[PDB]
Symmetry: C2
Subunit: 190 residues, 2 copies
């Protein structure tokens, strides 16, 4: 919690976001999302703040590809910013849940799933696991696995209001042979 | 003397795709994907060739957004080789393509009830119980509010009457669809 990396330059939307999450902290700018996250990995900073999704353009490829393939870091808070495109989701990445007293709007968990034989055909099994328990899917996005055409990993968000039910959901995924990476468990602030 | 639009400039990857797919044709370049499709919409050309999926970036946002939000046209062929690996041929019927035919597929853009992604499992279950294999699932913002999307699914079109019942079932659930294409898949 001392030093915080954000997507530069100074006065950026991401800068504005990092100020609210960490008002007492030393905020250091980095030139691109990859370097922001690498800054944490190198232990220069304590948390990193990056844009992850926009209401018009969609998910930020750079953020999710790096977080899945390379990083061993989690989203620990989400802040939604109005833009005058309209709304963007920003994640606070780190190792602990920071204390943030902004208006809480939601609880979520984000997963990166890969399927057996990397077949998209078994996606329904993964979604049914959460569906039958009434855990609502709020987002799904596919990204290239960077192996061959037709192999992907999936970014899925679910409501995380009932964390113990979610835990069983994840256990069932495992029992089915579906592999997942937890990208984050976090509160959503607007 | 068929005129065909492709994503420019001359010597682009898409040119090269079109060059191999359509050796007898007059190939006209356009500056961006949106303009390529408009070339067809405006009847300047008989077909347009645009990238739909990239090995690194993934699905091409521009292509799918325009086709969903703005155009009322279908892909009539897919070629496996702004993007690098999957290309759609847009037009009104399937043209002669001088590549190896590999597959029959259909791509659908789905919207869900109250536009929340939560009912996606229903759309997928509809195809799953019939043994219709999905080969891709992508989403794009609906451009309404954050958390609202439309969903692109590609599936095998091996059994067309089974597909027809699936669509009926989608309908009965209140899931709506736009057919982005019914097409054969060709390999360069």
């Amino acid at each position: 919690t001392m030093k915080i990396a954000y997507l530069g330059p100074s006065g950026s939307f991401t800068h504005n976001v990092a100020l609210h999450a960490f008002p007492a902290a030393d905020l250091l700018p980095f030139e691109n999302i990859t370097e922001v996250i690498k800054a944490y990995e190198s232990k220069q900073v304590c948390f990193a703040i990056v844009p992850v999704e926009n209401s018009i353009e969609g998910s930020v490829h750079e953020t999710f590809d790096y977080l899945f393939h390379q990083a061993k870091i989690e989203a620990v808070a989400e802040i939604i910013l109005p833009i005058k495109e309209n709304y963007t989701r920003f994640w606070v990445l780190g190792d602990e849940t920071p204390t943030i007293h902004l208006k809480e709007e939601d609880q979520k968990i984000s997963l990166a799933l890969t399927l057996p034989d990397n077949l998209p055909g078994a996606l329904y099994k993964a979604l049914s696991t959460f569906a039958w328990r009434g855990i609502d899917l709020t987002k799904i996005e596919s990204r290239p696995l960077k192996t061959i055409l037709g192999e992907y990993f999936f970014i899925i968000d679910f409501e995380n209001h009932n964390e113990k039910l979610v835990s069983f959901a994840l256990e069932e995924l495992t029992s089915i042979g579906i592999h997942y990476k937890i990208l984050g468990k976090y509160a959503v602030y607007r």
